[PDB]
């Protein structure tokens, strides 16, 4: 077939990024490393840092929507009781 429209990604040898000069990388084999030394000092010390950074953006919305749900229940509980029969008659019509 023919070539198609060009993209923002290529393949191995020509990936389309900028040219690199002056960066050096080092590594070691897995067979030469001690087994999994990365589970602990990571499930307590690091996992707590990740929790403390982001828990405020979830729990303030959750607190708003859960408080709104309970006040709706308790009011519906009350309207269909014997004490809340007179208020049920008004807010319907």
């Amino acid at each position: 077939g023919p070539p198609s429209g060009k993209t923002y990604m290529g393949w191995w040898g020509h990936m389309g990024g900028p040219k690199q000069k002056g960066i050096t990388s080092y590594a070691v084999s897995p067979y030469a490393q001690k087994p999994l030394q990365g589970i602990f000092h990571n499930a307590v010390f690091n996992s707590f840092r990740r929790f403390k950074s982001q828990f405020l953006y979830v729990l303030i919305p959750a607190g708003i929507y859960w408080y709104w749900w309970k006040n709706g229940n308790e009011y519906n509980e009350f309207l269909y009781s014997k004490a809340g029969r007179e208020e049920l008659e008004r807010v319907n019509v």
Partner: protein
């Protein structure tokens, strides 16, 4: 030829050749780059250029003398050459440069000009000579944090912080009679050399060099130096191999000759009996490769180096080459073993029976320093002729099959994949 060693306090070795028109005399020390630390890396390279400096060489050229020197990982050399009937002057010149008067050479003016000359050699090496500096980085990651990792020329960062006192300290600890061999090659008789030394009462320094704490240890690792402005990719790859004084010394050398060396632009090199060339030549994956088996006092390396311009098919070149290595354990033919026997003998004959007495002086001194004597070339041929197909499979299953690797590269190496995709190709497991 026939060698002859003695010990009158000084170890004297000789290899006479009545056909030569020259004679070489020198001294070889049993310390090199592997007997240094990262702070003084390059101090042996400065002693080379102080010996070859202009005011020292001028004194030699007035009597008909030429100088040479060579720095390697396990030894160092200082040779003087002359006509056959002038070898008595060669020893006197060597007397007033090492045994006496190596302070006139370390003057202030001679040390600053020499230093500036060495800083410019190592700078042009790191920016223009890509095949050799990638092979230096291979030794530096494979043997990291051990003495066998340090480069033989030094680095630009450690060279700048070297003063005269660093040169004098290194000489007091290593240029010793216990660590030295006096050699002679070409047209020189063994008895004429020893009687000339006895008539002078020479003694460099007594002995007991330092201890060298750590041993060499191979580590599987990689180092990548990416540069997208250069036009090729240069790669080297090796496993742990054999040291000298190993029983498998010649079996490792023979297994490298099975895959050999290649040049794409020479017509006869495309016709070699190497099965790997049927895969490479279809799409022209490389320009050249060469297989090596290097050997030192404590460890070794076995592998290959390559250079290519097909920067999109690098993974197919590395893949096809490692699938042939597997055949040494599984399926290697008797024909492949007999070809490699014949060419290895030709390779060793050219190295040891060249014409240059300077090359023969370096080989002799290094061998006598490390095993006490020199093996003949007629005895080495008999060992090579006694290697079987079963011996290659036993060696490969120990050293190659499912073993860690060391890698280094520079240039356009974006297409060189991760370590574990390459580590996995060392065992077939379709088997």
């Amino acid at each position: 030829a026939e060698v002859t060693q003695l010990s009158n306090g000084i170890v004297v070795a000789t290899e006479h050749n009545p056909s030569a028109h020259t004679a070489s005399v020198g001294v070889v020390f049993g310390s090199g780059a592997a007997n240094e630390n990262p702070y003084n890396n390059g101090v042996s390279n400065l002693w080379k250029n102080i010996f070859l400096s202009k005011e020292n060489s001028a004194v030699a050229a007035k009597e008909g003398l030429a100088l040479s020197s060579n720095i390697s990982r396990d030894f160092q050399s200082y040779i003087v050459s002359s006509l056959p009937g002038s070898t008595d002057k060669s020893l006197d010149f060597l007397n007033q440069s090492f045994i006496q008067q190596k302070a006139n050479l370390l003057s202030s003016s001679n040390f600053e000009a020499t230093k500036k000359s060495v800083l410019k050699q190592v700078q042009d090496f790191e920016e223009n000579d890509h095949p050799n500096r990638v092979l230096e980085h291979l030794h530096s990651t494979a043997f990291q944090n051990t003495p066998l990792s340090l480069p033989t020329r030094g680095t630009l960062e450690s060279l700048e912080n070297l003063v005269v006192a660093d040169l004098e300290s290194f000489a007091n600890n290593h240029f010793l009679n216990s660590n030295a061999v006096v050699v002679g090659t070409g047209n020189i008789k063994h008895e004429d050399l020893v009687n000339s030394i006895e008539s002078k009462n020479l003694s460099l320094q007594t002995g007991t060099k330092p201890v060298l704490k750590k041993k060499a240890a191979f580590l599987g690792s990689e180092v990548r130096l990416r540069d997208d402005t250069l036009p090729k990719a240069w790669i080297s790859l090796a496993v742990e191999g054999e040291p000298v004084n190993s029983p498998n010394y010649f079996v490792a050398k023979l297994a490298a000759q099975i895959f050999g060396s290649y040049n794409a632009f020479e017509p006869a090199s495309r016709l070699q009996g190497i099965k790997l060339l049927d895969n490479i030549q279809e799409y022209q994956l490389c320009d050249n490769f060469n297989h090596f088996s290097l050997s030192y006092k404590d460890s070794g390396l076995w592998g290959f180096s390559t250079a290519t311009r097909n920067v999109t098919m690098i993974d197919d070149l590395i893949h096809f080459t490692l699938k042939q290595w597997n055949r040494l354990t599984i399926s290697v033919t008797d024909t492949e073993v007999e070809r490699a026997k014949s060419l290895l003998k030709l390779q060793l004959g050219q190295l040891y029976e060249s014409g240059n007495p300077v090359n023969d002086a370096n080989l002799l001194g290094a061998e006598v320093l490390i095993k006490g004597s020199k093996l003949s070339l007629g005895e080495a041929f008999k060992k090579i002729d006694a290697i079987t197909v079963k011996d290659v499979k036993a060696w490969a299953g120990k050293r190659l099959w499912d073993q860690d690797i060391a890698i280094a590269g520079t240039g356009q190496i974006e297409g060189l994949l991760d370590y574990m995709r390459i580590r996995s190709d060392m065992s077939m497991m379709r088997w």
